[PDB]
Design a protein around this nucleic acid. Structure first.
Ligand SMILES: [Mg+2]
Ligand SMILES: [Zn+2]
Ligand SMILES: [Zn+2]
Ligand SMILES: [Zn+2]
Lengths: 177, 84, 551, 107, 270, 97, 171, 112
RNA sequence: AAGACCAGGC
DNA sequence: AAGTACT
DNA sequence: AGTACTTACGCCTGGTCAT
């Protein structure tokens, strides 16, 4: 398989596997308190689309580079520009990634690692939890009701008014097309 | 737990069991078409090639030495003196 | 080993957790309902009834099926079955404890008989050793036979403190056959302690009580020393024996179960039919019996459960008992392949570290070489050579994990080799082997020699290397084992080779010398009196192979 | 330390472990007529400071249990009055290397 | 039994002797850390012999016409007679061989001087002898400092245990002690020059060899010493093919069993 | 032929680790069984084809190992079990030391 | 919802490849047996980040054959849906029983009776669709779904989701 | 002092036969029999009761009986025993196996 | 093919 | 048969 | 003081009888 940074001492009776819900109870492998390889603790890693689009791209690119350091010895415009990056550094049988790049690049809400930067600098003043500070970043929202309902995990952790300013500043930063 | 390359305490020399096993292990791989890091002076027997790789100390291995409490020390064929 | 690849990662065993089976687990694991006692014949029709052995357990008749698990016979270990008892039974080997425990806890409320309150007790609760707590505890309260309700605390013996309740007197207990009995004291009261009862009292014992007594909440709760559900070892543990067809061949075990089964149903059918109250406990002993003998048969309560013909009955336990059995005779020591034995004889013409193997064997024993550019050539020749000439071989195996039997295969003479393939070849001059002579009680009772294929039929060893093996040629035989991995040999040549054993640590001195002729003669040849003339001196010189050619 | 002659009353002895910290010990005359430590065989032992001990461990990466033990009633252990936990250092002669340092903890 | 009782025992990389738990059994295999294989019966000349002989052989006094080294042996002989700063090393050396003596006579009361010990010095010199065709005529060329200051610098490198602390670097001196005595015994100024006329060459070699030959005689962390020791006993217990006391095989049985009622109980009182 | 106790004890003496294992496995027993990373048992229903693995009861499909051990051993174990004793096989040490 | 979890994997290398650029091979093989994998405990392993600084550590040599075994510690971008998670995607298939929306590398399906009422299903349509008073959902239309439940399977993950709630439906 | 005796005695049993055995061996044994506390007999009644895992003591004089009271009190076995491994078909931590061998990829480059 | 015995070899 | 250890 | 409990060399070759 692919082991996960923590050896939960399973003493025979493996039974309790709770429910997975927007009650913020995610499988054990996703507590907000997980472990880094260096052996440190580290908040979970919440990625809102169009923020992931940039991280996948970032590496997929820096891959192409170090993939040649050893060879010496606009919407529709990105659909092509990525398919290539793949047919270069991908497994070519990662039909998932392809389909993840379209999805990730069609439903994305930001093109500038700068715009994506503020998105983060903004939402990270909430104290809210990661999963939330994600659904908030990749989900259109005009009212607080359209928000605190499509993300029930908020309901009591923030005044409608506030979460509503944030949403204002969201459609304000939401890069155009 | 691991142990710094300094603070090291074991024996500076290779044990017979070690050397014994290295040559063997090494041969094993050599007999498996592993790359051979030494010019074969015409040799054609793996264990014999091994004895050679081990005399030019060009064997890419590392002997991890466990201690009764679990901690270990890591020595390289390179380092380890070979008296015998 | 086994063959056929498995996407399952592979590891080494590092820890072994000994537990006891929980009737609940036993079920879960099982794949067999095991209701019937018969073996097969679905009305004589051959196959197996969804009753005993194969209601999905392993199989026979060289037929894939094993719960689709296919793979068939070889590569499909047994799949446990279960068989719901009628009424709880003891565990022949645990009885000893099941008793000691009750004497440790009193019924009705089921709880210790000595709490922190008693001081001698404290000292008995610090001991961090199951074997030792449980052995100290027992000794400390086996005597007390009254469930104290109030005891004098750490203060005044005047003031009495309260804890658990129910002073129902505690009965001393004794072992009668496979049952436990106790009296309650003018004049006693003797009643039989029903399994059904004990079980209960245990079920109720506290969690910190388990532990306080030598146990473990997850792996071994006392309440498990009493069998309720019985695991059914699958064929491979109790295989058959077929004399082709229309005959039998069942294994001893597959009978005691057969019995246990019978004895189980007969019971049940009484608790749902004309149940003459206490004419049942005459058939519940029978179960307790079988389900006891099945595991152990060498008890003090005589009856051996002799099976028709008066032949004893191999209790599971008997299979592991010391020597000739599993542990000592199957695991700590086995029969092995790539091995041979014959008569030994001296031969003053072999180097010390050599050993004359007769051609007969050199052609029988084989070594797996892996085709490599360094050898290919040589190898293809051995293969071309066949399995009859000496320097040759007898088996080529390709990546495809398929054996080419060199003596048949319409492709014998053909075959091109492929780097990566293996070519089981004959033992050759200078293949390090492990030679030896029983009894082995020395590092030196087993040493490594250089092989030297020779004619005639006997392992010919050099003389000086005799005394270590401690052997004479008056008709003694010796064993020879043949390495298999390039690294295995390395371990023989680098630590077992005779040359290395010359100086023995058992007595910080050399352990091989010069004997008989060579010795006797080495003296004569010495004497001032002894003189040698040219004609000979020259030959003698020639004999020492390292003579520098300087008369 | 108290020295009884022919013996002490079992009614008496059970009164020593009743006033901690303070400790008491019992010795028969007949066992102190000769010093056991002066015997050709018995080599000399030595008490280790709860510091010197916490060291012996750290230096051999040992756990308390893995250490060679001495009886709480062992003749010599009484001659020095050890306590369950105290470690002694046994220094003896040796036909392989003059002196050999060994340790014994108590149980 | 013997075997089953000691399987698990071996020498661990720390150079301690433990089993499958970790329980130390010997803090140094055999109280000396030497693999039996490299050991021969040598003699500790320092022990046996009249207080008389001892002086005439190991004593050197540069302040005496009759107890100094006759310049016929050392090159810098005449220009030594009297040198006071030297007589202190010389005297240091002597006040040591002396200590050594008493020490040994405190361990081996018997007076037996022949014992098993690593590195056979007798021979190591013997080769040094004819390997440099040393002539018993002309004189040597060793500063007295050369000798005594090297012998010391030798002991230093005969490492058995290596530790970077005290408790360990202390067991070291121990595990060696016995050897050295023998060493200091065979490399005593007087001897080194009057008995075996070693040059500076010869000597510096004898020293190198001893050091290396010693570092070879150590024990290899890996040896399954347990089984070994077992066999080593059980083996000669079969060759036993058989003044009036329980003796031999039936006896050894008695011993391993820790039996209470031994046929013969005896007891010697001096 | 037979490679019994005594002949073993000498191999241990020699310190010939690998050669020992070889005589004991590759040249005699040797067997490949499966386990549950949960309940240290042979339960596992490996279908080495469609890779399916399961082990209902402890119910798995994910955490599963493969181990090589002497067939006699397996047997020793199965036999044990039938006597209602559980020999757990774990591929990782959790008790330290 | 997408995650960047810290994983590690164990690759057994035959000696053959014990070359000069081994690190290279490993990495390469890491990528073959990961990018595109699927587990209920990790979800979708999409891509391996920071290709370069991949930690290999020292690999140990097994003990019968020469194969060595390294614990490759890497870090990647994962994504595993949950019950009660709200996401939107592109419809792909649409039948009498409902339509299937594709949120990322995964496919969430929506039961006809798990949508609203006023929304019927028009079979005689081309392409096939679901008509409403004012709404029209077919092939490419973009919906936003609420995942009611998940089901892990082989090398993928499907789930059923509703659009019968508020703030759900087309966009 | 007892050790000294136990040894001295055993030493005499081998000396009365004109045989010689290097200290260390009888030493070791004599030491094995003594560390634990007092006199631990080389018999089913002694050394085969020590804290050594099950499987090891299992291979001697009490087998089953010993196995039974293992799953009873849920013992755990380190598999540090020579025996243990032999039963499992694993390479035992013994000489050739008192360590691991690894391929230092770094040093696998300067080699070319 | 398994198990019990008996004779025997070193 | 004996020897030990446990009742 | 009486009774009970587990053990007992290593390996190897023959021939014989029967539920
Ligand atoms: Mg004979
Ligand atoms: Zn099956
Ligand atoms: Zn009660
Ligand atoms: Zn399981």
């Amino acid at each position: 398989s692919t082991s996960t940074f923590q050896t939960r001492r399973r003493r025979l009776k493996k039974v309790e596997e709770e429910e997975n819900a927007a009650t913020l109870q995610l499988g054990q492998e996703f507590q907000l308190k997980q472990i880094n390889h260096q052996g440190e603790e580290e908040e979970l890693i919440a990625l809102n689309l169009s923020e992931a689009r940039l991280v996948i791209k970032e590496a997929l690119v820096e891959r192409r580079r170090a993939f040649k350091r050893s060879q010496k010895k606009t919407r529709e415009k990105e659909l092509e520009s990525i398919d290539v990056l793949l047919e270069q550094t991908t497994g070519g049988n990662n039909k998932d990634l392809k389909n993840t790049m379209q999805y990730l690049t069609n439903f994305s809400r930001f093109r500038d690692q700068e715009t994506v930067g503020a998105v983060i600098q903004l939402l990270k003043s909430t104290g809210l939890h990661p999963f939330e500070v994600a659904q908030l970043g990749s989900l259109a929202c005009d009212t607080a009701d359209e928000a605190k309902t499509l993300i029930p995990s908020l309901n009591n952790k923030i005044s409608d008014d506030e979460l509503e300013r944030i949403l204002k500043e969201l459609s304000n930063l939401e890069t155009l097309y | 737990k691991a142990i710094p390359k300094d603070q090291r305490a074991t024996t500076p020399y290779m044990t017979k069991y070690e050397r014994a096993r290295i040559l063997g292990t090494r041969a094993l791989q050599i007999s498996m078409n592993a790359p051979v890091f030494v010019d074969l002076e015409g040799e054609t027997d793996p264990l014999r090639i091994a004895m050679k790789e081990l005399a030019e100390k060009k064997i890419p291995l590392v002997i991890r030495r466990y201690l009764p409490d679990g901690s270990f020390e890591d020595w390289s064929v390179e380092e380890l003196i070979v008296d015998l | 080993v086994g063959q056929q690849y498995s996407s399952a990662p592979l590891r080494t065993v590092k820890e072994v957790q000994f537990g006891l089976f929980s009737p609940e687990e036993v079920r879960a694991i099982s794949v067999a309902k095991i209701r019937f006692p018969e073996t097969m014949d679905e009305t004589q029709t051959r196959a197996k009834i969804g009753g005993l052995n194969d209601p999905r357990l392993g199989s026979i008749d060289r037929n894939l099926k094993c719960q689709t698990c296919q793979e068939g016979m070889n590569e499909c270990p047994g799949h446990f079955g279960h068989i719901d008892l009628a009424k709880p039974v003891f565990h022949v080997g645990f009885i000893a404890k099941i008793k000691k425990v009750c004497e440790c806890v009193c019924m009705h409320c089921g709880k210790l008989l000595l709490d922190e309150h008693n001081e001698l007790m404290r000292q008995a609760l610090a001991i961090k050793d199951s074997k030792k707590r449980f052995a100290a505890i027992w000794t400390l309260c086996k005597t007390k036979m009254v469930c104290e309700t109030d005891v004098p605390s750490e203060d005044d013996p005047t003031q009495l403190v309260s804890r658990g309740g129910c002073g129902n007197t505690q009965p001393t207990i004794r072992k009668d056959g496979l049952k436990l009995v106790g009296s309650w004291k003018d004049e006693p009261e003797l009643r039989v302690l029903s399994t059904e009862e004990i079980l209960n009292i245990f079920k109720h014992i506290s969690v910190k009580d388990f532990t306080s007594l030598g146990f473990n909440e997850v792996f071994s709760r006392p309440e498990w020393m009493i069998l309720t559900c019985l695991p059914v070892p699958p064929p491979p543990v109790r295989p058959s024996i077929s004399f082709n067809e229309s005959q039998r061949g069942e294994d001893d075990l597959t009978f005691k179960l057969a019995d246990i089964l019978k004895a189980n149903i007969s019971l049940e059918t009484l608790e749902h039919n004309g149940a003459p109250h206490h004419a049942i406990e005459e058939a519940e002993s029978l179960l307790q019996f079988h389900v006891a003998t099945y595991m152990d048969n060498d008890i003090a309560g005589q009856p051996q459960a002799l099976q028709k013909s008066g032949r004893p009955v191999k209790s599971i336990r008997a299979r592991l008992k010391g020597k000739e059995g599993r542990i000592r005779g199957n695991l700590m020591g086995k029969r092995v392949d790539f091995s041979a034995r014959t008569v030994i004889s001296g031969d003053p013409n072999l180097e010390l570290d050599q050993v004359g193997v007769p051609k007969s064997i050199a052609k029988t024993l084989t070594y797996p070489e892996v085709v490599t550019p360094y050898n290919i050539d040589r190898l293809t020749q051995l293969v071309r050579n066949g399995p009859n000439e000496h320097p040759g071989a007898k088996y080529v195996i390709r990546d495809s994990g398929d054996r080419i039997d060199l003596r048949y295969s319409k492709r014998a003479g053909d075959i091109q080799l492929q780097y990566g393939w293996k070519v089981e070849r004959h033992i050759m001059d200078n293949d390090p082997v492990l030679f030896n002579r029983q009894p082995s009680l020395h590092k030196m009772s087993m040493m490594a020699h250089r092989v030297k294929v020779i004619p005639y039929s006997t392992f010919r060893l050099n003389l000086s290397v005799t005394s270590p093996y401690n052997a004479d040629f008056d008709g003694d035989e010796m064993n020879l084992h043949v390495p298999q991995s390039e690294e295995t040999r390395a371990e023989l040549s680098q630590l077992c080779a005779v040359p290395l054993q010359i100086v023995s640590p058992q007595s910080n001195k050399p352990c091989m010398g010069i004997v008989q002729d060579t010795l006797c003669g080495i003296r004569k040849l010495t004497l001032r009196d002894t003189f040698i003339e040219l004609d000979q001196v020259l030959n003698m010189l020639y004999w020492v192979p390292d003579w520098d050619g300087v008369i | 330390i108290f020295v009884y002659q022919n013996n002490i009353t079992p009614s008496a002895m059970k009164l020593v472990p009743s006033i901690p910290p303070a400790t008491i010990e019992t010795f028969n005359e007949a066992a102190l007529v000769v010093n056991i430590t002066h015997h050709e065989l018995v080599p000399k032992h030595i008490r280790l400071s709860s510091d010197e001990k916490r060291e012996l461990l750290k230096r051999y990466r040992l756990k308390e249990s893995q250490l060679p033990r001495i009886q709480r009633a062992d003749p010599v252990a009484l001659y020095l009055g050890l306590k369950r936990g105290e470690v002694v250092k046994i220094i003896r002669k040796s036909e392989t290397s003059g002196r050999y340092a060994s340790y014994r903890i108590c149980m | 039994r013997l075997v089953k009782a000691l399987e698990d025992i071996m020498v661990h990389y720390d150079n301690t002797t433990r089993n499958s738990l970790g329980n130390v059994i010997q803090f140094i295999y055999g109280e000396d850390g030497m693999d039996a294989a490299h050991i021969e019966k040598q003699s500790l000349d320092t022990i046996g012999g009249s207080d008389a002989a001892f002086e005439k052989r190991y004593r050197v006094d540069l302040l005496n016409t009759d107890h100094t080294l006759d310049p016929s042996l050392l090159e810098s002989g005449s220009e030594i007679l009297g040198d006071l700063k030297l007589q202190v090393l010389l005297d240091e050396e002597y006040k040591q061989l002396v200590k050594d003596r008493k020490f040994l006579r405190e361990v081996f009361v018997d007076g037996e001087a022949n014992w098993p010990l690593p590195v056979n010095i007798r021979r190591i010199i013997q080769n040094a002898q004819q390997t440099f065709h040393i002539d018993h005529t002309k004189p040597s060329d060793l500063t007295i400092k050369d000798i005594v200051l090297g012998v010391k610098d030798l002991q230093e490198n005969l490492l058995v245990l290596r530790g970077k602390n005290e408790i360990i670097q202390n067991a070291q001196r121990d595990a060696v002690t016995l050897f050295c005595c023998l060493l200091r015994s065979r490399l005593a100024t007087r001897r080194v020059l009057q008995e075996y006329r070693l040059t500076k060459q010869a000597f510096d070699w004898v020293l190198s060899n001893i050091e290396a030959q010693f570092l070879r005689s150590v024990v290899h962390p890996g040896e399954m010493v347990g089984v070994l020791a077992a066999q080593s006993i059980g083996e000669p217990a079969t060759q036993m093919t058989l003044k009036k006391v329980t003796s031999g095989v039936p006896r050894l049985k008695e011993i391993l069993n820790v039996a209470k009622n031994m046929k013969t109980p005896s007891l010697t009182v001096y | 032929l037979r490679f019994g106790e005594m002949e073993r004890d000498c191999m241990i003496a020699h310190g010939a680790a690998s050669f020992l294992k070889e005589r004991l496995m590759e040249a005699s027993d040797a067997f490949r069984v499966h386990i549950c990373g949960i309940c240290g048992l042979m339960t596992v229903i490996a279908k080495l084809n469609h890779n399916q693995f399961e082990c209902k009861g402890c119910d798995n499909k994910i955490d599963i190992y493969q181990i090589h051990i002497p067939y006699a051993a397996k047997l020793l174990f199965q036999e044990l079990m039938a006597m209602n004793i559980t020999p757990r096989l774990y591929t990782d040490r959790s008790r330290d030391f | 919802m997408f995650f960047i979890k810290d994983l590690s994997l164990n690759i057994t290398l035959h000696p053959s490849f014990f070359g000069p650029r081994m690190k290279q091979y490993l990495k390469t093989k890491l990528l073959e047996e990961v990018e595109g994998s699927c587990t209920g405990k990790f979800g979708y392993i999409l891509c391996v980040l920071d290709y370069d600084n991949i930690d290999i550590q020292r690999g140990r040599i097994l003990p019968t054959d020469g194969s060595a075994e390294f614990n490759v510690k890497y870090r990647a971008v994962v994504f595993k849906p949950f019950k009660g998670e709200v996401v939107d995607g592109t419809v792909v298939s649409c039948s009498q029983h409902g339509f299937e929306v594709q949120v990322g590398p995964m496919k969430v399906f929506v039961t006809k009776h798990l949508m609203p009422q006023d929304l019927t299903f028009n079979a005689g349509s081309n392409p096939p669709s679901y008509q409403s008073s004012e709404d029209v959902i077919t092939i490419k239309s973009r919906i936003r779904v609420k995942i009611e439940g998940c089901i892990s399977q082989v090398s993928s993950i499907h789930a059923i989701g509703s659009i019968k709630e508020d703030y759900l439906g087309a966009i | 002092a007892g050790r000294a005796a136990l040894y001295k005695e055993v030493y005499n049993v081998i000396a009365s036969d004109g045989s010689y055995v290097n200290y260390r061996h009888m030493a070791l044994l004599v030491d094995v029999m003594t560390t634990q506390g007092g006199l631990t007999s080389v018999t089913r009644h002694g050394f085969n009761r020590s804290n050594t895992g099950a499987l090891m003591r299992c291979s001697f004089e009490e087998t089953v009986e010993i196995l039974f009271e293992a799953g009873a009190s849920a013992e755990l076995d380190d598999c540090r025993g020579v025996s243990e491994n032999v039963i499992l078909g694993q390479m035992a931590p013994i000489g050739t196996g008192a360590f691991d061998v690894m391929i230092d990829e770094e040093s696998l480059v300067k080699y070319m």
